[PDB]
Amino acid sequence: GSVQIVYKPVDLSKVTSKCGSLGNIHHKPGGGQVEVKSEKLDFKDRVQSKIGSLDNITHVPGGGNKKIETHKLTFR
Amino acid sequence: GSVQIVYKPVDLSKVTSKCGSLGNIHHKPGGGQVEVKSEKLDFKDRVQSKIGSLDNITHVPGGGNKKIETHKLTFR
Amino acid sequence: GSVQIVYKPVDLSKVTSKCGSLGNIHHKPGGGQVEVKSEKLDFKDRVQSKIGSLDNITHVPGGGNKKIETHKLTFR
Amino acid sequence: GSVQIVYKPVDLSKVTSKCGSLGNIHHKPGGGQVEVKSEKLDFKDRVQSKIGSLDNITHVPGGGNKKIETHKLTFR
Amino acid sequence: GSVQIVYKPVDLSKVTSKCGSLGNIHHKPGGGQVEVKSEKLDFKDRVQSKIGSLDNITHVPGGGNKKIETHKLTFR
Amino acid sequence: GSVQIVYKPVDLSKVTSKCGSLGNIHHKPGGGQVEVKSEKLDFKDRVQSKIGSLDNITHVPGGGNKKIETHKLTFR
Amino acid sequence: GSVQIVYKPVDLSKVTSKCGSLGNIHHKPGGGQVEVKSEKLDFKDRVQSKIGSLDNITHVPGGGNKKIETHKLTFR
Amino acid sequence: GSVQIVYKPVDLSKVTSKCGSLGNIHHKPGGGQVEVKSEKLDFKDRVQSKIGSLDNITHVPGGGNKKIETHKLTFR
Amino acid sequence: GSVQIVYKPVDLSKVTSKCGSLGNIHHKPGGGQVEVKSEKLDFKDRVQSKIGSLDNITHVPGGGNKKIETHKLTFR
């Protein structure tokens, strides 16, 4: 039939931050082990994997603001 | 038939933060173990996985504001 | 029939940050082991993998702001 | 006076050990911090000292037997 | 006076060890920070000292037996 | 006076070890970090000292037996 | 004392068979599958193992008679 | 003392068979599959192993008679 | 004392067979597949192993008779 779909989302939004001095941050990790013992790995379709990782992250963004959007229109 | 769909969500919202001095932050982890013993792994469709991970994160964003949106319209 | 799809998402949005002095950040990791013992890997289609990684990240962007969009229009 | 001293301690003793297989010893310390914050130090005569130290000792002597003697004769 | 001193300690002693296979010893320290903060140090006579040290010792002597003697004769 | 001293400390002692295979010894330190801080130091007589050390030792003597003696005679 | 053991068992026995025509023997099994799906095998001390064996045996001895003996004399 | 052992067993036994025509023996197994799927094999001390064997045996001895003996005399 | 051992087992036994015509034996197995799929083999001391064997044995001895003996005399 005479099907009609209008997709018109209007976005005027704002993500903002104000900060003074940002600093004097100390990160001193004391080491330590990670250990993974296994047998054969068998990953198939679309698998996402992380094994035995050791991370030490210092992340000091002045802003660090995030806006995430996902506009979707499926028709069949 | 003569079906009509109007999708017009209007967003005028704001996410905001104000801060003075941001600092004098100390992170001193005392080490320590992570340990995983296993047999064969068999991940199939769309599997998401993490094993035996050790993390030390210092995250000091001056703003750090988050806005997440998911506009969706499915038709058959 | 006379099927019609209009996709006109209007975006006037903004991600912003203001910060003063950004500095005096110290990151001093104490080492430590990562260990992964295994048998054969058998990865097939679309697999994403990380194994046995040791990371030390210092990340100090002046802005570090992110805007992510994913517009999608699928038709059958 | 006409003093006489005979010092004739006779030692016929034995310290002994017999051992079969000695092994399969594991020592896995997880790191971690040790810290000393102070004022002026003023150590004097005959001191034996350890300050803020982190130690890991593995000692597997096949014998490890100890015999200690201290013979003394003071005359005035 | 007509003083006489005989110092004839007789030693026939033995320290002994017998051992089979000696092995499969693992020592895996995980790192870490060590810190000593102070003002000026003023150490004097006969001092033995260790400061802020991070140490790992593996000692596997096949024998490792010790015999210590200290013969002393003072006359006045 | 008519003083006499005889110092005849006979010693027929033995320090001994018999050992099989001596091996498969592993030593894997994970690194680390060290800080010692002070305003300029002052150390005097007969000192043994170590500052800010980061030290690994593997010591596998097939004997490693020790005999120590001292035979002090003082006459006044 | 004068311990004595006499071991003098007399065997005069017979194992016997008489048969006419031995034949018109058919062994016609209808085939068929054997299937074993597994993971890693980890056999240690004294293991005796068979996996997936398929046998078709036709055994037609004209006699097939058996006599088994085990004479034993233990002294302490 | 005067310990004495006499081992003098007499064997006059017989294993015997009489058979007429031995024949018209058919062995026609219909084939068939054997399948073994596995991961890594890890056999250690004294392991005895068979995997996937397929046998077709036709055994038609005219006699096939057996006599087995095991004479033993142990002294301590 | 006067220890004595006499070992004089007398064997006058017989294993015998009589058979007429020996023949008209057919062995026609319908073939068939054998399949072994695996990962790496890791065999150590005293391992006895067989993998994937296919056998077709026809054994038609005119006699096929067996006589087995095992005389043993152990002294300590």
Author numbering:
A (entry chain G), B (entry chain E), C (entry chain C), D (entry chain F), E (entry chain H), F (entry chain A), ...: 304 to 379
What does the paper behind this entry write?
Residues 297–391 (using the numbering of the longest human brain tau isoform) constitute the proteolytically stable core of paired helical filaments (PHFs) from the brains of individuals with Alzheimer’s disease. Here we use time-resolved cryogenic electron microscopy to study the in vitro assembly of recombinant truncated tau (amino acid residues 297–391) into paired helical filaments of Alzheimer’s disease or into filaments of chronic traumatic encephalopathy. At later time points, the first intermediate amyloid disappears and we observe many different intermediate amyloid filaments, with structures that depend on the reaction conditions. At the end of both assembly reactions, most intermediate amyloids disappear and filaments with the same ordered cores as those from human brains remain.
